[PDB]
PDB file of C-alpha atoms and ligand atoms in Angstrom:
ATOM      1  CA  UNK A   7      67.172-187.913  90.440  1.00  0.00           C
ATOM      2  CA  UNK A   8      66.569-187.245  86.806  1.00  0.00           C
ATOM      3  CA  UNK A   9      66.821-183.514  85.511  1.00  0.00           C
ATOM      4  CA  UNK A  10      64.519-181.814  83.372  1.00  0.00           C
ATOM      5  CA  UNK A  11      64.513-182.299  79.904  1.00  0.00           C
ATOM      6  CA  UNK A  12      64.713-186.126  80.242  1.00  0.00           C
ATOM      7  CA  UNK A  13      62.887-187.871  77.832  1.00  0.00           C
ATOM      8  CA  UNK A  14      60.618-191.059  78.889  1.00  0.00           C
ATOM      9  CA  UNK A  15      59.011-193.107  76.239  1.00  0.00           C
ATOM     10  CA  UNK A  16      55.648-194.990  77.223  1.00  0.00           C
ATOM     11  CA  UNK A  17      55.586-198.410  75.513  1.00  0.00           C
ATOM     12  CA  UNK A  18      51.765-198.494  75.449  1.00  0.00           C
ATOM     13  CA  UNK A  19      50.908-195.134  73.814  1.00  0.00           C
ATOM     14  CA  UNK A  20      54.293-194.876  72.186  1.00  0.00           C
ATOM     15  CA  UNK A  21      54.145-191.615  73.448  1.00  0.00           C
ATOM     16  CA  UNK A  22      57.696-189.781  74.294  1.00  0.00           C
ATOM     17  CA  UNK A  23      57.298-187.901  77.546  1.00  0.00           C
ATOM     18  CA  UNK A  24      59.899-185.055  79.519  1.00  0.00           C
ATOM     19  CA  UNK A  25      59.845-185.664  82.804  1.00  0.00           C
ATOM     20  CA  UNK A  26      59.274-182.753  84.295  1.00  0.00           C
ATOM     21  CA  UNK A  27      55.782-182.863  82.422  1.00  0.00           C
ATOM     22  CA  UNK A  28      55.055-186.125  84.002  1.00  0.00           C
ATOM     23  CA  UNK A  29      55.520-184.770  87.279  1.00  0.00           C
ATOM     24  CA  UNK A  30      54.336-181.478  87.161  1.00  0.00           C
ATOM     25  CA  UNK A  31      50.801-183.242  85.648  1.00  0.00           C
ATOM     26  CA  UNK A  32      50.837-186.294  87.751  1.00  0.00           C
ATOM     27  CA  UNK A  33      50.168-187.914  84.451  1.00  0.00           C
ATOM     28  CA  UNK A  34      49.903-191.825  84.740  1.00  0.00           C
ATOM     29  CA  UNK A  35      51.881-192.833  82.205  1.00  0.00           C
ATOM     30  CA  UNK A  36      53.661-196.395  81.154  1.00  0.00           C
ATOM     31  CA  UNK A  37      57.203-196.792  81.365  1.00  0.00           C
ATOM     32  CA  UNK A  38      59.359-199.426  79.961  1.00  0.00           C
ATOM     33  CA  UNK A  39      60.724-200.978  83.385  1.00  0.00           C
ATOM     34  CA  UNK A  40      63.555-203.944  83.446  1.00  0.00           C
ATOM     35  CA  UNK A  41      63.136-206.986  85.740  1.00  0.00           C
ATOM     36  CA  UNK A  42      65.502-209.022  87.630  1.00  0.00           C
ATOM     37  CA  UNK A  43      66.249-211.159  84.679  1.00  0.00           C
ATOM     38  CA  UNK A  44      66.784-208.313  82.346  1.00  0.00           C
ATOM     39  CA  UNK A  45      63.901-208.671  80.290  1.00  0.00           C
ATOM     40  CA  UNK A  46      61.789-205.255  79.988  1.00  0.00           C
ATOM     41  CA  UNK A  47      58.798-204.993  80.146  1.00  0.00           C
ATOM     42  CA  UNK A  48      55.634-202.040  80.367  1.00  0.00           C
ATOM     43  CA  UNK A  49      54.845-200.692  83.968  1.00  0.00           C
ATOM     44  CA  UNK A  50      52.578-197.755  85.262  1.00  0.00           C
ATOM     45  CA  UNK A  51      54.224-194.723  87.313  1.00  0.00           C
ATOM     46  CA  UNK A  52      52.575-194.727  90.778  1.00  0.00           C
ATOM     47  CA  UNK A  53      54.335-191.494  92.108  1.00  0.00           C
ATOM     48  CA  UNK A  54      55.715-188.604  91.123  1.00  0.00           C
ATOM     49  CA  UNK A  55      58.376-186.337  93.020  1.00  0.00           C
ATOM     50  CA  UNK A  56      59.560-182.856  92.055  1.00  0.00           C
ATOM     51  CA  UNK A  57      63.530-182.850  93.831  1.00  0.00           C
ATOM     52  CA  UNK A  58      64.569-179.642  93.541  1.00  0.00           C
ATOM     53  CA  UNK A  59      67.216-178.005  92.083  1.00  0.00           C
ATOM     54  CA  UNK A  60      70.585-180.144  92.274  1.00  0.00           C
ATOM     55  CA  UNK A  61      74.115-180.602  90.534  1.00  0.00           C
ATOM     56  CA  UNK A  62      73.765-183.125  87.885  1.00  0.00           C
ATOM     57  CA  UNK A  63      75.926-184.423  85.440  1.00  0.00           C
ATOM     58  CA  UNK A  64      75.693-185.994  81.740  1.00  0.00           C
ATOM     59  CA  UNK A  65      76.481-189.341  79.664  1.00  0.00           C
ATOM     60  CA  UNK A  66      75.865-189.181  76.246  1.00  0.00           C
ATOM     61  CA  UNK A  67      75.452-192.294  74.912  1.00  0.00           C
ATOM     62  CA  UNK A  68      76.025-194.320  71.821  1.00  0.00           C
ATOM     63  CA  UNK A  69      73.224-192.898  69.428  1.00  0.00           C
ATOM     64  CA  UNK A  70      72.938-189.608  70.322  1.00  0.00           C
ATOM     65  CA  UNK A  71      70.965-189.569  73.481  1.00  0.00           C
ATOM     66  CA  UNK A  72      72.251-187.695  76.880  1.00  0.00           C
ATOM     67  CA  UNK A  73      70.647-188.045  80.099  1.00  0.00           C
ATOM     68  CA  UNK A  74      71.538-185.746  82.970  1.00  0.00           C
ATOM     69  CA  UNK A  75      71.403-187.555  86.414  1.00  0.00           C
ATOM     70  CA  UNK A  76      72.421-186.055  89.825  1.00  0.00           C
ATOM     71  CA  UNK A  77      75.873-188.471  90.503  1.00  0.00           C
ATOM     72  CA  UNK A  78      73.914-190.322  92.566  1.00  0.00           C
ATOM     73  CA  UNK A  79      71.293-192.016  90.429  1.00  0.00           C
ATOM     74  CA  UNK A  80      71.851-195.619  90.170  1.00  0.00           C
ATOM     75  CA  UNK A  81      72.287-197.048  86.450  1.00  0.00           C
ATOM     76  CA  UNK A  82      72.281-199.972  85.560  1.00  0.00           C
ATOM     77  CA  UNK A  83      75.107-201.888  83.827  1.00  0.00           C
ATOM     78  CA  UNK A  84      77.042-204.834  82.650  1.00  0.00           C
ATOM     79  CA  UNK A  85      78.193-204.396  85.803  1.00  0.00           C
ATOM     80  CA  UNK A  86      75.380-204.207  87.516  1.00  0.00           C
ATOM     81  CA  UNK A  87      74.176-201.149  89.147  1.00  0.00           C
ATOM     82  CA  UNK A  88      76.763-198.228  89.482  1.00  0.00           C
ATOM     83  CA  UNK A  89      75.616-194.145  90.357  1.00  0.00           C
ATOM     84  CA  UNK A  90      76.149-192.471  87.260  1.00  0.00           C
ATOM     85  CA  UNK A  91      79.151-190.235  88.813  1.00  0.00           C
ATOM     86  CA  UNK A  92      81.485-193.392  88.963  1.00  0.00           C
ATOM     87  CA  UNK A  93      80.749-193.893  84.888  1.00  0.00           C
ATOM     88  CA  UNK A  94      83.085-193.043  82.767  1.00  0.00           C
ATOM     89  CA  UNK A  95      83.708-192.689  78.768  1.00  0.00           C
ATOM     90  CA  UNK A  96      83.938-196.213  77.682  1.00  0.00           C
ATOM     91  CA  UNK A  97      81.819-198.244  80.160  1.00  0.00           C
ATOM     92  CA  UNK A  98      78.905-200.086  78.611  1.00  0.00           C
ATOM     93  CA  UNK A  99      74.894-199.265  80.428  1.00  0.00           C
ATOM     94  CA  UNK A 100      72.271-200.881  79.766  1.00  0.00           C
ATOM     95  CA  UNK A 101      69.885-199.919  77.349  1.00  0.00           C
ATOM     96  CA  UNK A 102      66.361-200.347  75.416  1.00  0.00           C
ATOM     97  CA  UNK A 103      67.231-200.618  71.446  1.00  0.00           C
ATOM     98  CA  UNK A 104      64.565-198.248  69.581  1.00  0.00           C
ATOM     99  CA  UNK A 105      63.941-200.292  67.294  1.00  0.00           C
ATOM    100  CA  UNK A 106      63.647-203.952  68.762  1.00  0.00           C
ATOM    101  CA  UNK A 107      62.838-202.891  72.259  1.00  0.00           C
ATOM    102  CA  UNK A 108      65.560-205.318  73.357  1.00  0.00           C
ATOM    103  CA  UNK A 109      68.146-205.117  76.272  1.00  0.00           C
ATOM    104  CA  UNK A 110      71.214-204.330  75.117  1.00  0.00           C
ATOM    105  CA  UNK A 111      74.600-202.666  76.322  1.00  0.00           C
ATOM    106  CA  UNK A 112      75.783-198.746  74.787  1.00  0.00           C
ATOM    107  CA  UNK A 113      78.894-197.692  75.540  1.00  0.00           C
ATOM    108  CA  UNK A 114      78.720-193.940  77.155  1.00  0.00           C
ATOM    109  CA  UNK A 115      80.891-191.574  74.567  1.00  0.00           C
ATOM    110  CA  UNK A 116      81.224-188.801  77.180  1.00  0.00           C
ATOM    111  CA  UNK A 117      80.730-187.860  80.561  1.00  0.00           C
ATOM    112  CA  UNK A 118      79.226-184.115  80.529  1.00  0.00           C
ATOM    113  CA  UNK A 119      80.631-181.577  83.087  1.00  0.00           C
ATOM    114  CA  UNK A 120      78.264-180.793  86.221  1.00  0.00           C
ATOM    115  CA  UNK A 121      75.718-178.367  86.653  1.00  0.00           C
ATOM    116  CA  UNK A 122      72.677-176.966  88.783  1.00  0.00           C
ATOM    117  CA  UNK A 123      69.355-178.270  87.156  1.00  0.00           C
ATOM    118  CA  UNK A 124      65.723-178.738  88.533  1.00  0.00           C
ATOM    119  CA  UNK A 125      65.573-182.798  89.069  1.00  0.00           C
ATOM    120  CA  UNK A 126      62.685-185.355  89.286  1.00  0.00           C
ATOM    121  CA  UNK A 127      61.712-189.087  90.195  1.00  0.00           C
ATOM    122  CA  UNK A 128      58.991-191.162  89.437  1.00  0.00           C
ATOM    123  CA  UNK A 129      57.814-194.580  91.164  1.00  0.00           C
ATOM    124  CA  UNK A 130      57.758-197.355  88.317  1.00  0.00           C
ATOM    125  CA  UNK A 131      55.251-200.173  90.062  1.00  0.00           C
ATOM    126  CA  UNK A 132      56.493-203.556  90.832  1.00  0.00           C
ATOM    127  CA  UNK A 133      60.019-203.127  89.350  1.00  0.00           C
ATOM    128  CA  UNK A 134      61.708-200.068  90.440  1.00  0.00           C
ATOM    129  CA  UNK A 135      63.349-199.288  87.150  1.00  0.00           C
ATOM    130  CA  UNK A 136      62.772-197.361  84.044  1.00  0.00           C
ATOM    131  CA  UNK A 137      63.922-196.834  80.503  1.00  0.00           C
ATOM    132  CA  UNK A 138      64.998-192.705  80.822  1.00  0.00           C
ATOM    133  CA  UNK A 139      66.511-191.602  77.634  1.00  0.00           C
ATOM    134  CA  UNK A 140      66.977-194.884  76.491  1.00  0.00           C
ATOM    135  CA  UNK A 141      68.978-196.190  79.030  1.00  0.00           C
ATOM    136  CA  UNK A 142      68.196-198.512  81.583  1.00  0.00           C
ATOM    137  CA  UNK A 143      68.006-196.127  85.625  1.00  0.00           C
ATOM    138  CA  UNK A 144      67.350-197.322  89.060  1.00  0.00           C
ATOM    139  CA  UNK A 145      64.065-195.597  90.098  1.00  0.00           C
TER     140      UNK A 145
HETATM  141 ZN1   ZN B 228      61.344-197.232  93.553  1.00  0.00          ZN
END
């Protein structure tokens, strides 16, 4: 689960979304979703689900951006997909490039201590997967 503050950008309105507004609103938003062959491409949220409060923990990544995950949360990586509590300062994710749009790998600067925060999870149609602060998460 993703917790709140989690920023989700929607490729069609260009539109920058926190999660916990996209679930709280049941808004039907766009994500940016990756496919098998790790191309990415835009897909509609078909469900929204409010978690809870739950520990979560944070990788900031090259650029700036952090996202805070419960350990569990899948990410994906050069590697393949990994929960986010096995990461660890140096190992490369998978990412959406601002400026391109492209797939590419960032390597995660630091892995934030864990906390209690209010989580969420959307349904991404088709592929299962969405671009959450830039990075590439199993959804
Ligand atoms: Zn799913």
């Amino acid at each position: 689960c993703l917790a709140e503050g989690t920023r989700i950008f929607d490729p069609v309105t260009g539109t920058t979304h926190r999660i916990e507004d996209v679930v709280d609103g049941r808004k039907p938003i766009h994500v940016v979703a990756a496919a098998k062959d790790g191309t990415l491409h835009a897909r509609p949220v078909v469900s929204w689900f409010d978690q809870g409060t739950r520990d979560v923990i944070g990788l900031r990544i090259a650029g700036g951006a952090i996202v805070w995950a419960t350990p569990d949360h899948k990410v994906l990586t050069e590697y393949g997909w990994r929960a986010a509590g096995e990461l660890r300062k140096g190992d490369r994710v998978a990412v959406r490039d601002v400026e391109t749009g492209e797939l590419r790998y960032s390597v995660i600067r630091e892995v934030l201590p864990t906390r209690r925060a209010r989580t969420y999870d959307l349904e991404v149609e088709e592929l299962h997967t969405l671009v959450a602060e830039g990075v590439v998460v199993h959804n």
